[PDB]
């Protein structure tokens, strides 16, 4: 699966984030993953062994 992000710089090139102009600022992404995913490890609230 591929889940594209929909932030300000993600859909149009005109707002592309210039790392080149951020020489001294590192850009980080935080990702929180769900504990329960329907049909994968839970069916409703019941865990899938």
Partner 1 sequence: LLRGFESSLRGSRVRTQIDDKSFIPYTWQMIDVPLAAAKTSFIAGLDTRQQLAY
Partner 2 sequence: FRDTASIGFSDTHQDEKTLRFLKKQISQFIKHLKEYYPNNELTKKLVMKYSDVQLLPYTKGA
**Residues at the contact surface with partner 2, assessed by CB under 8 A:** 19-20, 22-26
| Distance in angstroms (rounded) separating the CA atoms of residues 16 and 7 | 10
| Distance in angstroms (rounded) separating the CA atoms of residues 1 and 14 | 27
Q: Which residues bind a second copy (CB under 8 A)?
A: 1-5, 7, 9-20, 26-41, 43, 48
- After which residues are there C–N gaps above 2.5 Å in the chain? none
Q: Applying CB under 8 A, does 26 fall inside the site for partner 1?
A: no
Nearer to partner 1, 27 or 47 (CB): 27
Least Cβ distance, residue 13 to partner 1 (angstroms):
18
């Amino acid at each position: 699966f591929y889940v594209p992000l929909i932030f300000f710089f993600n859909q149009t090139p005109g707002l592309a984030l210039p790392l080149i102009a951020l020489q001294y600022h590192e850009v980080k992404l935080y990702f929180t993953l769900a504990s329960q995913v329907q049909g994968v490890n839970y069916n409703g609230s019941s865990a899938i062994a």
